[PDB]
Amino acid sequence: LLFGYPVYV
Amino acid sequence: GSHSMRYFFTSVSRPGRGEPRFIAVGYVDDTQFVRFDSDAASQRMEPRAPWIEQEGPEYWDGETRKVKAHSQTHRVDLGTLRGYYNQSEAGSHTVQRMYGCDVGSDWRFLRGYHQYAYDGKDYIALKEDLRSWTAADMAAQTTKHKWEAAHVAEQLRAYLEGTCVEWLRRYLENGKETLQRTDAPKTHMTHHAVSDHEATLRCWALSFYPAEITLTWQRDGEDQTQDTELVETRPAGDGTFQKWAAVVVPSGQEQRYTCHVQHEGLPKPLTLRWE
Amino acid sequence: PWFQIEDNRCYIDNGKLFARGSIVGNMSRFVFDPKADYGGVGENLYVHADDVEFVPGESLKWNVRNLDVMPIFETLALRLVLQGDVIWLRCVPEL
Amino acid sequence: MIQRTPKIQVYSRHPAENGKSNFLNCYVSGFHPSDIEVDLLKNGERIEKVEHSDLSFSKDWSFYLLYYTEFTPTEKDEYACRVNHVTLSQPKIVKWDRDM
Numbered sequence A: 001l002l003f004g005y006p007v008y009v
Numbered sequence B: 001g002s003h004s005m006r007y008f009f010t011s012v013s014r015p016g017r018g019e020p021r022f023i024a025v026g027y028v029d030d031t032q033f034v035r036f037d038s039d040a041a042s043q044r045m046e047p048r049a050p051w052i053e054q055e056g057p058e059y060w061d062g063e064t065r066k067v068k069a070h071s072q073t074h075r076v077d078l079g080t081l082r083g084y085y086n087q088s089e090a091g092s093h094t095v096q097r098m099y100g101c102d103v104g105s106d107w108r109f110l111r112g113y114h115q116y117a118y119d120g121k122d123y124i125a126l127k128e129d130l131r132s133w134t135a136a137d138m139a140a141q142t143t144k145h146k147w148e149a150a151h152v153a154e155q156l157r158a159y160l161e162g163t164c165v166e167w168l169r170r171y172l173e174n175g176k177e178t179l180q181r182t183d184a185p186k187t188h189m190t191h192h193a194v195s196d197h198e199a200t201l202r203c204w205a206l207s208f209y210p211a212e213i214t215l216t217w218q219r220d221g222e223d224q225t226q227d228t229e230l231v232e233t234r235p236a237g238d239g240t241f242q243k244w245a246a247v248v249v250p251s252g253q254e255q256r257y258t259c260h261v262q263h264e265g266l267p268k269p270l271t272l273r274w275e
Numbered sequence C: 001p002w003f004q005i006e007d008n009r010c011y012i013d014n015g016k017l018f019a020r021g022s023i024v025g026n027m028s029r030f031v032f033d034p035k036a037d038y039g040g041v042g043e044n045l046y047v048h049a050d051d052v053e054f055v056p057g058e059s060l061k062w063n064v065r066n067l068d069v070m071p072i073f074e075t076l077a078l079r080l081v082l083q084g085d086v087i088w089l090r091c092v093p094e095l
Numbered sequence D: 001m002i003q004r005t006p007k008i009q010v011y012s013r014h015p016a017e018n019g020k021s022n023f024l025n026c027y028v029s030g031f032h033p034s035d036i037e038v039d040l041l042k043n044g045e046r047i048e049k050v051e052h053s054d055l056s057f058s059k060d061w062s063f064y065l066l067y068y069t070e071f072t073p074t075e076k077d078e079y080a081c082r083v084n085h086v087t088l089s090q091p092k093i094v095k096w097d098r099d100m
Helices: B059-085 B138-149 B153-176
Strands: B003-012 B021-029 B031-037 B094-103 B109-118 B121-126 B133-135 B186-193 B199-207 B214-219 B222-224 B228-230 B239-248 B257-262 B270-272 C001-014 C016-025 C030-039 C042-044 C052-055 C059-068 C073-081 C085-093 D007-012 D020-030 D037-042 D063-071 D079-084 D092-095
Touching: B003 B059, B021 B059, B021 B153, B031 B059, B031 B239, B059 B138, B094 B153, B094 C073, B109 B153, B121 B138, B133 B138, B138 B153, B138 C059, B153 B270, B186 B257, B186 B270, B199 B214, B214 C001, B257 C073, B257 D092, C001 C073, C001 C085, C016 C085, C059 D020, D007 D079, D007 D092, D020 D037, D020 D079
Parallel strands: none
Antiparallel strands: B003 B021, B003 B094, B021 B031, B094 B109, B109 B121, B121 B133, B186 B199, B199 B239, B214 B222, B214 B257, B228 B239, B257 B270, C001 C016, C016 C059, C030 C042, C030 C073, C052 C059, C073 C085, D007 D020, D020 D063, D037 D079, D079 D092
16 A cells, blocks of 8 residues: 655655 | 565656656566566556466556556656756656565565666665665755655655555565565586686576575585686576586596585585586 | 463375374464475475364364375475464374 | 666566467566566577566666566477667577476
8 A cells, every 4th residue: 555645855 | 584565667768759758667576576667558456476366456456556656756866866967858868766665574664765866877766764864975865855854764664664565565475476486596516617627517506486596506515616607597488597517627536516506495505516 | 471382193005195293282373384305306285174183272283185196295394483482393104 | 867778588477388378477676767668589589479567676676577468489489588778789588498
């Protein structure tokens, strides 16, 4: 199952 | 033995030729089980292993939504990175991301990962303590500061130690017939005369699973590295793997050499000798 | 994590394998991985779920019935992983 | 910008046997960037129905792909894999050899 929160460099 | 789940994301910018190409794949050990291709027609996370197809519609709608969201954050990342590295708006660049977890034979969390690369080299990675970041260079420090302010480590840690390992266990159980069973390597040795003075002995391991394997040559019972060649383990295309190891020997001395094969699918290591 | 092998026998009757065994222990999960051994090389065997009975925390028993095995069949190589611990059993067909 | 040239292995899924349908594989790995051209050849001519796995990569971030197609080995027919990548001044061709 994928991680559910947005992450931006 | 021990197991792992990993997601691999690759996003490639195509300046002036549309949206970046985004490809995502998910693996449990050496078996791919899902994928998403921004260029394919389905526009959905798709199954690539039989055991994941027993997951219901909410699973697929959720993974599809989340993977599209990963797609969009990477689209933004390419722009952000082009900026951090003061690069032209015209070149094609590649951002990669990988995250996932490992469990030991006891199925307990063993280790977690969450890291990015830009244009073929490390950019930033979560350390094994699942608490701090390792910025590969100066530019990455900006991201590091940004992630610390946004508490990205805390969110990732909760997922890696909880959700990740929980679903990995679920996958291991639903797919036990193919993820937890082994396929022993079928082995044999070939002989090829190189000249009148030398001959090549090649030790073969075919149709095995998992991919992990050790092929070693010994001469009179002692490990031999010199004059040997070991190719990269490779996919047979049906879910199993292949590998071979070769050693160049003096003509007439073939009998001194033995190939040793170690693999989880064997009650005990195998030893092969020419003839 | 403990377990002990109670039984493990097998026999072939007209191209079919029959194998029964039992293991008691406190395993919470298991993997039943039977292999046919043709003397050196083999292949995985597939058994119907009805021929395997697992009682979490208590036991793992098998009662493989009418499994077609090739004539080349020699011995049953049984790989089992109980609570993560791997053990191999070997069964020689009888009478 | 770190670039890496592709490693190439051409082989069959099952032991080659003239007359018996098999699968011809060309495994390319350890490369970067991901753009790459891979063609399976039969007597120097491009085979049309060639499939490939979904792009993925290793620990060191280098990519790998499996290109494959159904084929029936014959005593005379020759097969090979042709790969082109930015790290190559020209297409590289690796011939299929039953012994590897």
